[PDB]
Amino acid sequence: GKLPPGPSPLPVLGNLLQMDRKGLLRSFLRLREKYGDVFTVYLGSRPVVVLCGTDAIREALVDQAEAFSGRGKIAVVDPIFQGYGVIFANGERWRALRRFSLATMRDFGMGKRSVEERIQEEARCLVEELRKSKGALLDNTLLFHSITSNIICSIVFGKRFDYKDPVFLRLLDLFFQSFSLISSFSSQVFELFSGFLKYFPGTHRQIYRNLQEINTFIGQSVEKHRATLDPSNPRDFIDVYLLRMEKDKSDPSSEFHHQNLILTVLSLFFAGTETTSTTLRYGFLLMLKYPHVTERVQKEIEQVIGSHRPPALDDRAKMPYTDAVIHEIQRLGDLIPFGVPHTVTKDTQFRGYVIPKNTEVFPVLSSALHDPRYFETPNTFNPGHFLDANGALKRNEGFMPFSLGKRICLGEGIARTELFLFFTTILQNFSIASPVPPEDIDLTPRESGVGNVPPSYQIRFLARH
Ligand code: HEM
Ligand SMILES: Clc1ccc(-c2cnc[nH]2)cc1
Numbered sequence: 001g002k003l004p005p006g007p008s009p010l011p012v013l014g015n016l017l018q019m020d021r022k023g024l025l026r027s028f029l030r031l032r033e034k035y036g037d038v039f040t041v042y043l044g045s046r047p048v049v050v051l052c053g054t055d056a057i058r059e060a061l062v063d064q065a066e067a068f069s070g071r072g073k074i075a076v077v078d079p080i081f082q083g084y085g086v087i088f089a090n091g092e093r094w095r096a097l098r099r100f101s102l103a104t105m106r107d108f109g110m111g112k113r114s115v116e117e118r119i120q121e122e123a124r125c126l127v128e129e130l131r132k133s134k135g136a137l138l139d140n141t142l143l144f145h146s147i148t149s150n151i152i153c154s155i156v157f158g159k160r161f162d163y164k165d166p167v168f169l170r171l172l173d174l175f176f177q178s179f180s181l182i183s184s185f186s187s188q189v190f191e192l193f194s195g196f197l198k199y200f201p202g203t204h205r206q207i208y209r210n211l212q213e214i215n216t217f218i219g220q221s222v223e224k225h226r227a228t229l230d231p232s233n234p235r236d237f238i239d240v241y242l243l244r245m246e247k248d249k250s251d252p253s254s255e256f257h258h259q260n261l262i263l264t265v266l267s268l269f270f271a272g273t274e275t276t277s278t279t280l281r282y283g284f285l286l287m288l289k290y291p292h293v294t295e296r297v298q299k300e301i302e303q304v305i306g307s308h309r310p311p312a313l314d315d316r317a318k319m320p321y322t323d324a325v326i327h328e329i330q331r332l333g334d335l336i337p338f339g340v341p342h343t344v345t346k347d348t349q350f351r352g353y354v355i356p357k358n359t360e361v362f363p364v365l366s367s368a369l370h371d372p373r374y375f376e377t378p379n380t381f382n383p384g385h386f387l388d389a390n391g392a393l394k395r396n397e398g399f400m401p402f403s404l405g406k407r408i409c410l411g412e413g414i415a416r417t418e419l420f421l422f423f424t425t426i427l428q429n430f431s432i433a434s435p436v437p438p439e440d441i442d443l444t445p446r447e448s449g450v451g452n453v454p455p456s457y458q459i460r461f462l463a464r465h
């Protein structure tokens with residue numbers, strides 16, 4: 001049936017000569033200009049199909065959902081996962097882990113705190129910590145990585161860490177350094193010649209080393225959980241997984257074993273810590289660049305929530321402006337630019353082309369979030385993209401920051417609740433400022449690869465009264 005159009009490759013080097021030195025995303029966007037919304041490019045010797053624009057992505061991930069439900073690989077972390085854990089698994093193993101992960105977080109019995117309550121509690125701890133800074137200028141990177149890591153810790157380990165805990169800070173350091181390395185230029189070259197470059201020194205080794213040190217901490221927590229498990233009262237995600245292992249003792253095809261336990265927990269930290277945190281850091285940078293918008297969010301908080309009680313998730317339905325602002329922070333932040341690689345699960349017929357089973361497919365989410373066919377002046381921040389004439393929230397088919405289809409972000413619910421409660425609880429309690437004039441605020445990513453990493457910046461949180 002034939003593959004989608006694309007630059008003729010050279011053996012070994014593939015399409016290296018037709019790439020853009022800026023990175024994989026620019027390379028993909030440049031090729032889209034020449035070959036259309038659906039093309040083939042060779043990363044090293046591997047052929048991959050690229051889908052660009054809202055329409056093409058929706059046709060694949062939604063209209064042929066099952067076919068495009070396969071998961072590809074990211075070379076610098078594949079040595080860690082190797083097909084285990086809920087993110088990088090395929091087939092029955094993925095189906096089983098996803099179903100269990102959704103159900104285990106979608107509800108944690110009674111007597112325990114809901115996910116919304118754990119986030120409100122973390123937002124309260126955050127407010128207390130920021131009050132201690134007395135409004136001094138700071139870089140919010142560490143605290144924003146802390147609050148989102150703490151939500152996953154609460155869910156998986158059954159508790160949060162104090163912001164000044166040495167264990168926590170070390171773990172935080174390992175993770176953050178890894179995300180920066182993972183979307184660095186080197187990791188993107190590694191994506192092309194891993195088969196060859198895997199044999200040499202480099203950042204891919206430091207990434208591996210850091211993630212294994214985190215897996216070691218995960219393993220020791222699993223042992224502590226095992227040693228104190230009370231079947232009558234599971235405490236968190238690990239206890240629930242351990243109880244399922246007991247339930248499946250006689251099932252030789254169960255996927256609930258050790259490797260999927262450690263790597264599913266790593267998956268939830270990997271995914272649950274990084275993107276929500278960078279979205280929040282990018283959102284506050286935009287709020288410094290658009291003080292008028294920040295002021296309107298604070299006015300809506302005052303009208304709907306007031307200044308005494310904490311924001312609750314059900315306030316969001318009565319706060320369309322703030323909700324539109326968060327949508328727009330996600331849309332312009334474009335935190336996972338070329339998506340997380342998929343693969344087709346069978347030879348697939350797509351737009352008159354044939355995509356062979358297991359071929360890697362990149363749904364370039366950035367090209368939908370910035371799709372001119374759906375968003376006027378896509379490169380400019382405007383909450384109005386999500387608001388109708390009456391100020392009510394409006395949907396846009398191009399808005400797919402969590403992707404779409406069978407692989408749609410498993411943590412979407414948790415992430416949206418974290419964005420709404422952290423953004424509103426911070427702005428209800430603090431006004432923000434920085435020495436940089438709004439006009440001079442640069443939104444350009446410090447690094448752009450599988451993740452977009454926002455630039456560092458200074459900000460102050462002044463307690464309100
Ligand atoms: C603003 C925050 C977040 C954004 C924009 C985001 C978005 C994404 C995207 C674009 C994908 C790939 C979907 C695909 O394969 O097509 C993904 C997958 C995933 N995300 Fe997130 N994510 C966020 C937060 C979270 C959180 C908080 C968790 C965990 C609690 C999480 C868990 C996962 C997992 C486990 C997958 C793989 C799902 C599967 O393969 O079935 N994410 N996310
Ligand atoms: Cl390689 C990779 C995989 C998954 C994510 C992710 C999912 N949800 C948030 N982040 C990011 C990068």
